[PDB]
Amino acid sequence: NVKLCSLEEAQRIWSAEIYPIMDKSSRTRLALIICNEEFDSIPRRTGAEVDITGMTMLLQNLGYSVDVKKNLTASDMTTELEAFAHRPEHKTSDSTFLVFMSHGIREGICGKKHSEQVPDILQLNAIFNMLNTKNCPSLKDKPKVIIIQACAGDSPGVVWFKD
Amino acid sequence: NVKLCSLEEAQRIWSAEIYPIMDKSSRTRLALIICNEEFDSIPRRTGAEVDITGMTMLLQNLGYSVDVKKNLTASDMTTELEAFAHRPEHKTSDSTFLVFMSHGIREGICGKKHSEQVPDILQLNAIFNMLNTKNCPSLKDKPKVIIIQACAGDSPGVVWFKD
Amino acid sequence: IKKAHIEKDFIAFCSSTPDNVSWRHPTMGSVFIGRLIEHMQEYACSCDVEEIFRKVRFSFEQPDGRAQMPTTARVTLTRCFYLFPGH
Amino acid sequence: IKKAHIEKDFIAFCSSTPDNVSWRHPTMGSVFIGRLIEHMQEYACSCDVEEIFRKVRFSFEQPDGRAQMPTTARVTLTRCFYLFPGH
């Protein structure tokens, strides 16, 4: 589904300001999609399957082995992220993608059990921490792309004007 | 002090994915530098004058009228930012630069009276808010560049490894 | 022992600005995700991810109907990240 | 009345990553500021600000001595911002 970079296009791009790409035959690229659709106290995220399909197909076609996890608390998300960061395939990888899709608030991403009374939130800060050089040494010097589909609060994010 | 963009260079760059530049003769570009050097409870930021000089000269040579404010509390910084956002010159400007130079912590930029006991902090959130489309309508659709020289916490920001 | 940066080579791309809503059609999917796939499909061949993400942001420029503005956050990419699709 | 995005066309460039120190020589000035001036001086003519800022980040790549990593934050630039120095 992705337009291909031709040999003359890759040569045109290639100098020392580009992340090195590993040999196609030996590399083990990994990506993770966490998507919450069903919640304890928030309406079902209908249409999430369309998102899961599109992102999985795209990332696979970009060369990534894609793992999909569904309907998790912030704690389970944390465990999953910890397991993902420790995967030995990252050592023979050149990059990674992390996709989070859920309800969201200003504080962060909503776990399946989130409520205004009892918060269940994965912070953006925690995501970075779990994938940094200390906790994920295998991705040191390698691009880590984090994609988030969620609200960052409940404001429509607009201002009105006459003129 | 800035290498000039030649006529053939500007033509090479010029299509619809670039911020429009206003006519040199009619435009009134503004920039603001806030630099704290002297503090109530933190050691003097020696060498700050070198920073002030360099940034002022650079921004002037890029075409900006530069205002410099020194040794302010978070409240005074706020008032200054509010006054800056309301300046009518922005209507006949195409862009702006905001430079903040101070001691810093994770929460934000330190005012002159900051202490662990009594915090005096300008949040990054507040800076954006004061310069957004509601509070600074004259810079709607125009690039706003914020430059911060400060600590974002007290960690050296490193991890050690054997191999 | 040797020193290394604790945080480097990160980029985050969020569906909306802080405080603000992101939109999702009940059958068509999330607008940001749909827009992201389409731009990655078209531009991964010729643009680095930062450039692609900027192109996604441009597509939301006009605040028509259900307005939102995707944001790039906490960027420590030291080089350009090209996907080199096909390679 | 008409709608407009509350937050758009912003870029922030910070001297270090969250939690982390930035460095300043007592007579030579702040390293990030010095590095920023030098890169703006050289590259404003040919690179947009996002590209310049990435180049600044690259220069800190090796965590030699007093390590720090400048960060681009909260980016809603929808287009490339070229300074066009001289124009």
- Tallying the residues shown for chain D, one arrives at 87
CA distance C72 to D6: 16
Cα A6 vs. chain centroid, distance in angstroms? Answer: 27
Q: Which two tokens stand for residue C76?
A: 């420590």
CATH number at residue A29: 3.40.50.1460
Q: Is A157 on the interface with D (CB under 8 A)?
A: yes
A136 labelled catalytic: no
Cα B52 vs. chain centroid, distance in angstroms? Answer: 12
Residue A44 backbone dihedrals phi, psi, to 5 degrees: -55, 135
Report the gap between the CA of D27 and the closest CA in chain C (Å).
Answer: 26
Q: Which two tokens stand for residue B59?
A: 């921004």
Of A76, A81, A84, A152, the closest CA to residue A112 belongs to A76
How was this structure obtained?
A: X-ray
Residue-range definition of the domain harbouring residue D32? 1-87
Cβ separation of D72 and C69 shorter than 8 Å? no
CA distance A58 to A46: 21
Partner B, chain D 17-46, Cβ-Cβ below 8 Å: 17-22, 24-30, 32-34, 36-37, 40-46
> Rounded to the nearest 10 degrees, how much is the dihedral formed by the CA atoms of A83, A89, A94, A95?
-30
Report the gap between the CA of C31 and the closest CA in chain D (Å).
Answer: 16
Partner C, chain D 42-71, Cβ-Cβ below 8 Å: 50, 54, 57-58, 60-61, 63, 67, 69, 71
Report the gap between the CA of D47 and the closest CA in chain B (Å).
Answer: 9
Of B123, B54, B139, A81, the closest CA to residue D73 belongs to B123
Residue that is written with structure tokens 């990593």 in the block: D69
Q: How far apart, in Å, do the first and last CA atoms of chain C sit?
A: 36
CA distance B12 to B15: 10
Cβ separation of D80 and B19 shorter than 8 Å? yes
Who contacts B157 (Cβ-Cβ below 8 Å, separation ≥6)? C5, C6, C7, D16, D17, D19, D20, D21, D67, D68, D69
Specify the number of domains making up chain C. Answer: 1
* DSSP, residue by residue, B23-88: PTTT---EEEEEE----SSS---TTHHHHHHHHHHHHHHTT-EEEEEES--HHHHHHHHHHHHT-G
CA distance D30 to B10: 32
Q: Which two tokens stand for residue B127?
A: 């800076």
Nearest CA in chain A to D5: A158
Nearest CB neighbour to C61, from listed D6, D72, D78: D78
* Residues C39-69: b if buried by 16+ CB within 10 A, e if exposed: bbbebbbbbbbbbbbbbbbbebeebeeebbb
Residue D45 is given by DSSP the state T
Specify the number of domains making up chain A. Answer: 1
* DSSP, residue by residue, chain A: -PPP--HHHHHHH---SBPPPPPTTT---EEEEEE----SSS---TTHHHHHHHHHHHHHHTT-EEEEEES--HHHHHHHHHHHHT-GGGGG-S-EEEEEES-EETTEEEPTT--SSS--EE-HHHHHHHTSTTT-GGGTTS-EEEEEES-SSSB--EEEE--
Q: Is C5 on the interface with B (CB under 8 A)?
A: yes
SS (H, E, C) chain C: CEEEECCCCEEEEECCCCCECCCEECCCEEHHHHHHHHHHHHHCCCCCHHHHHHHHHHHCCCCCCCCCCCEEECECCCCECCCCCCC
Q: How many Cα neighbours within 13 Å face the side chain of B148?
A: 32
Residue-range definition of the domain harbouring residue B128? 1-163
- Coil, helix or strand for B138? helix
CATH number at residue C41: 3.30.70.1470
Q: Is B155 on the interface with D (CB under 8 A)?
A: yes
Q: Residues B35, B90, B103, B110: which is the catalytic one?
A: B103
